[PDB]
């Protein structure tokens, strides 16, 4: 059957060195006990001014409410997207918002600083065994942390090695920089194989349940480290104890599409196709080059769904932690309407009377896939935030479908449903 090893077993410490050397442990003793408290501070400071939320994620086509409660803290303007769920940062006091909360954040920045030293240190020693040093620093340049909290007393049975009950099931970490590390700080409050009452992080090789898996006991204060490509070659998971448990997992998030600066400049590029002397509801474009015309209709989709729909779907939760994204999400919504107008503008032009059908159809082909995907995704977002696991959530937890308007709204140039604006266009393209 399936086997697993812990410190209790003799094979454990030699299995660790042969098939998981890129996993690293640092027990509570490698950390000042004053840092220890001013991290155990905010785990609860943040815990009960209630900043941590269970996410309504998507896995394998089905909508789930995750056991673990979470919060993204980190670099300002940064997002981290796992499971088609874009998390936005409660921000750090980084170089260049309530009083206690903002202290919590500054703290995990200090923690972050510390780990990122320790990560580099151990990455050098790791590298000093297999025989640039700016590769090493980037892969430790953590830009976010995802805090996780679970109280076991409120779980699935670990299938392959009988490891017991799982807070988090066997997975790989998403949206990480390639070969970048992760540093976990682990805070626990208070026999054949592993102790059920203490928390473990489990480890397995990918595609492989024949090799026995590792079950690392994590006590109050212990940090572990997934180094380089180990996250890629290895699956991991979390084994639940009997007590509550907090964890700060520090990541190098792949935000090349993930930074406010990013989505903003995307918008700006999309609006270069606009006569922009005045902000009003009669959008006039500067080109109808089918190339330019898809790029903006694509940026329209990107800002809509990867940002607005994502933000508002986990409706109202940050207003608790910070208002940081408020103005920006307003501004992004603003830019988004102008693009609803740009869309309109393109539609009015494709049935304008002296337009040669030859590149009217070039224009259709240019924008069609975009307006389709805007429907597919509009349906899916409509459906997923009024599915009724979704309204079982309480007052300020509701999935808001924003933005949204209906037929009886002439403040919007276009309908929410585009079903046969779309079909209407491909009829042309066949006839
Ligand atoms: O608390 C720990 O020490 C371990 C935490 C942990 O492994 N978290 N995992 C993630 O944050 C994560 C990142 N990218 C994709 C998925 C996940 C976790 C996950 C997997 C399956 C269901 C819910 C959450
Ligand atoms: Ni993980």
From Swiss-Prot:
<feature type="modified residue" description="N6-acetyllysine">
    <location>
        <position position="156"/>
    </location>
</feature>
<keyword id="KW-0560">Oxidoreductase</keyword>
<comment type="function">
    <text>RNA demethylase that mediates oxidative demethylation of different RNA species, such as mRNAs, tRNAs and snRNAs, and acts as a regulator of fat mass, adipogenesis and energy homeostasis. Specifically demethylates N(6)-methyladenosine (m6A) RNA, the most prevalent internal modification of messenger RNA (mRNA) in higher eukaryotes. M6A demethylation by FTO affects mRNA expression and stability. Also able to demethylate m6A in U6 small nuclear RNA (snRNA).</text>
</comment>
<dbReference type="InterPro" id="IPR037151">
    <property type="entry name" value="AlkB-like_sf"/>
</dbReference>
<dbReference type="GO" id="GO:0016740">
    <property type="term" value="F:transferase activity"/>
</dbReference>
<dbReference type="GO" id="GO:1990984">
    <property type="term" value="F:tRNA demethylase activity"/>
</dbReference>
<feature type="region of interest" description="Loop L1; predicted to block binding of double-stranded DNA or RNA">
    <location>
        <begin position="155"/>
        <end position="164"/>
    </location>
</feature>
<dbReference type="GO" id="GO:1990931">
    <property type="term" value="F:mRNA N6-methyladenosine dioxygenase activity"/>
</dbReference>
<dbReference type="GO" id="GO:0044065">
    <property type="term" value="P:regulation of respiratory system process"/>
</dbReference>
<keyword id="KW-0007">Acetylation</keyword>
<dbReference type="GO" id="GO:0005829">
    <property type="term" value="C:cytosol"/>
</dbReference>
<comment type="similarity">
    <text>Belongs to the fto family.</text>
</comment>
<comment type="subunit">
    <text>Monomer. May also exist as homodimer.</text>
</comment>
<dbReference type="GO" id="GO:0070350">
    <property type="term" value="P:regulation of white fat cell proliferation"/>
</dbReference>
<dbReference type="GO" id="GO:0090335">
    <property type="term" value="P:regulation of brown fat cell differentiation"/>
</dbReference>
<feature type="binding site">
    <location>
        <position position="82"/>
    </location>
    <ligand>
        <name>substrate</name>
    </ligand>
</feature>
<dbReference type="GO" id="GO:0043231">
    <property type="term" value="C:intracellular membrane-bounded organelle"/>
</dbReference>
<dbReference type="GO" id="GO:0005634">
    <property type="term" value="C:nucleus"/>
</dbReference>
<protein>
    <recommendedName>
        <fullName>Alpha-ketoglutarate-dependent dioxygenase FTO</fullName>
        <ecNumber>1.14.11.-</ecNumber>
        <ecNumber>1.14.11.53</ecNumber>
    </recommendedName>
</protein>
<dbReference type="GO" id="GO:0001659">
    <property type="term" value="P:temperature homeostasis"/>
</dbReference>
<dbReference type="Pfam" id="PF12934">
    <property type="entry name" value="FTO_CTD"/>
</dbReference>
<dbReference type="InterPro" id="IPR038413">
    <property type="entry name" value="FTO_C_sf"/>
</dbReference>
<dbReference type="GO" id="GO:0005737">
    <property type="term" value="C:cytoplasm"/>
</dbReference>
<dbReference type="GO" id="GO:0042245">
    <property type="term" value="P:RNA repair"/>
</dbReference>
<feature type="binding site">
    <location>
        <position position="224"/>
    </location>
    <ligand>
        <name>2-oxoglutarate</name>
    </ligand>
</feature>
<feature type="binding site">
    <location>
        <position position="70"/>
    </location>
    <ligand>
        <name>substrate</name>
    </ligand>
</feature>
<dbReference type="GO" id="GO:0016180">
    <property type="term" value="P:snRNA processing"/>
</dbReference>
<feature type="region of interest" description="Fe2OG dioxygenase domain">
    <location>
        <begin position="6"/>
        <end position="256"/>
    </location>
</feature>
<feature type="binding site">
    <location>
        <begin position="245"/>
        <end position="247"/>
    </location>
    <ligand>
        <name>2-oxoglutarate</name>
    </ligand>
</feature>
<keyword id="KW-0408">Iron</keyword>
<dbReference type="GO" id="GO:0061157">
    <property type="term" value="P:mRNA destabilization"/>
</dbReference>
<keyword id="KW-0479">Metal-binding</keyword>
<keyword id="KW-0223">Dioxygenase</keyword>
<feature type="binding site">
    <location>
        <position position="148"/>
    </location>
    <ligand>
        <name>2-oxoglutarate</name>
    </ligand>
</feature>
<feature type="binding site">
    <location>
        <begin position="171"/>
        <end position="174"/>
    </location>
    <ligand>
        <name>substrate</name>
    </ligand>
</feature>
<dbReference type="InterPro" id="IPR024367">
    <property type="entry name" value="FTO_cat_dom"/>
</dbReference>
<dbReference type="GO" id="GO:0060612">
    <property type="term" value="P:adipose tissue development"/>
</dbReference>
<dbReference type="GO" id="GO:0040014">
    <property type="term" value="P:regulation of multicellular organism growth"/>
</dbReference>
<keyword id="KW-0963">Cytoplasm</keyword>
<feature type="binding site">
    <location>
        <position position="171"/>
    </location>
    <ligand>
        <name>Fe cation</name>
    </ligand>
</feature>
<dbReference type="GO" id="GO:0035516">
    <property type="term" value="F:broad specificity oxidative DNA demethylase activity"/>
</dbReference>
<dbReference type="InterPro" id="IPR032868">
    <property type="entry name" value="FTO"/>
</dbReference>
């Amino acid at each position: 059957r399936g086997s697993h090893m812990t410190p209790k077993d003799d094979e454990f410490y030699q299995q660790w060195q042969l098939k998981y050397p890129k996993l690293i442990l640092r027990e509570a003793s490698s950390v000042s006990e004053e840092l220890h408290k001013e991290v155990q501070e905010a785990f609860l400071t943040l815990h009960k001014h209630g900043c941590l939320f269970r996410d309504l994620v998507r896995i394998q086509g089905k909508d789930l409410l995750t056991p673990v409660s979470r919060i993204l803290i980190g670099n300002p303007g940064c997002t981290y997207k796992y499971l088609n769920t874009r998390l936005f940062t409660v921000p750090w006091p980084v170089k260049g918002t309530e009083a206690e909360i903002a202290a919590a954040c500054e703290t995990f920045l200090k923690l972050n600083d510390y780990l990122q030293i320790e990560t580099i240190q151990a990455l050098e020693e790791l590298a000093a065994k297999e025989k640039d040093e700016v590769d090493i620093k980037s892969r430790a340049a953590y830009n976010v942390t995802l805090l996780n909290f679970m109280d076991p007393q409120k779980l699935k049975e670990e299938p392959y090695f009988g490891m017991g009950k799982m807070a988090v099931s066997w997975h790989h970490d998403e949206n990480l920089v390639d070969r970048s590390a992760v540093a976990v700080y682990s805070y626990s409050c208070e026999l054949e194989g592993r102790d059920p009452d203490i928390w473990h992080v489990g480890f397995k090789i990918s595609w492989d349940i024949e090799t026995p898996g590792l079950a690392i006991p994590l006590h109050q204060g212990d940090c572990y480290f997934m180094l380089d490509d180990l996250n890629a070659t290895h699956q991991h998971c979390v084994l639940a104890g009997s007590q509550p448990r907090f964890s700060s997992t520090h990541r190098v998030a792949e935000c090349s599409t993930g930074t406010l600066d990013y989505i903003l400049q995307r918008c700006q590029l999309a609006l270069q196709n606009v006569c922009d002397d005045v902000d009003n509801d009669d959008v006039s474009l500067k080109s109808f080059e089918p190339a330019v015309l898809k790029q903006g209709e694509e940026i329209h989709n990107e800002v809509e769904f990867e940002w607005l729909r994502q933000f508002w779907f986990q409706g109202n939760r940050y207003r608790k932690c910070t208002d940081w994204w408020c103005q920006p999400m307003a501004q992004l919504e603003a830019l988004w309407k102008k693009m609803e107008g740009v869309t309109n503008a393109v539609l009015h032009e494709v049935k304008r009377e002296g337009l040669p059908v030859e590149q009217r159809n070039e224009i259709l082909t240019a924008i069609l896939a975009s307006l389709t995907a805007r429907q597919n995704l509009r349906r899916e977002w409509h459906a997923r935030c009024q599915s009724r696991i979704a309204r079982t959530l309480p007052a300020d937890q509701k999935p808001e479908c924003r933005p949204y308007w209906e037929k009886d709204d002439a403040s919007m140039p276009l309908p929410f449903d585009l079903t046969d604006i779309v079909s209407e266009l491909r009829g042309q393209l066949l006839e």
